[PDB]
Design a protein around this ligand. Sequence first.
Ligand SMILES: CC(=O)N[C@@H]1[C@@H](O)[C@H](O[C@@H]2O[C@H](CO)[C@H](O)[C@H](O)[C@H]2O)[C@@H](CO)O[C@@H]1O
Lengths: 132, 135
Amino acid sequence: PHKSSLPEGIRPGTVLRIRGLVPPNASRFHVNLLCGEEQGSDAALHFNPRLDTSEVVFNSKEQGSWGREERGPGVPFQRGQPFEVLIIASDDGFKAVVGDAQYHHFRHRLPLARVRLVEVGGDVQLDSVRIF
Amino acid sequence: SNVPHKSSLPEGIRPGTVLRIRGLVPPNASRFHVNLLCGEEQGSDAALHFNPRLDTSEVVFNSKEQGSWGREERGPGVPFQRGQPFEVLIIASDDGFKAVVGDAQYHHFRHRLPLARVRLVEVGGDVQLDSVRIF
Ligand SMILES: CC(=O)N[C@@H]1[C@@H](O)[C@H](O[C@@H]2O[C@H](CO)[C@H](O)[C@H](O)[C@H]2O)[C@@H](CO)O[C@@H]1O
């Protein structure tokens, strides 16, 4: 479960670039933007490609409980295929771009200034996470 | 080549807008530019003029306001090369445009004109464009 702090935190204009590869037998994976390093922290953003149920869920987790989930249109991920995801924080939400195409917009539920680290986990071969 | 390349931005741009430009600098390139213009008229104001000069080995950033060019800012060295491809990310943030060349932070240009005035992206000069995407 990859983890990495966001030194200056994240703000409108912060881009997260995740490059990786979906393992040949992957079932699903996720990227979480957490507000604390404590286990079970509020997730300002939970991005979850599910190669098995063929859907991509976006969601929040606050004070311990999940929230209203949103689903993207289709799964822009292929097993055994490499990918590149851009997560862009704008003044009003996170834009999820998957290889040259805007995929989904997620409106902020917790305040951007509460996000402190990225966590990438699940069935994924993570090559690199870069914050711009 | 696909230059000059012009892309309209009807609703303008805001903090969190990303411009990704990929292309090849050709063998005899002198220089090329990426402008964030305020109108489609010739000589329009420019919130951002990004100008890699392969012929003088400098990378210049400027703005044009009221038909008047501002004070040029120079980035740290030339991270471009004739006969070599490139990828540039111009990210609009709360206080400036972040220029990322070749996977590394290259220069930060503090805003000079209000972001709400940008209405066009133009790419031209000695460059052979692969793609310009705006996210
Ligand atoms: C159709 C539907 O409502 N499905 C939901 C599932 O999304 C949900 O699964 C969990 O979802 C969270 C994010 O919402 C995490 O991805 C977690 O890993 C999943 O187990 C389940 C459980 O809440 O409820 C329905 O099945």
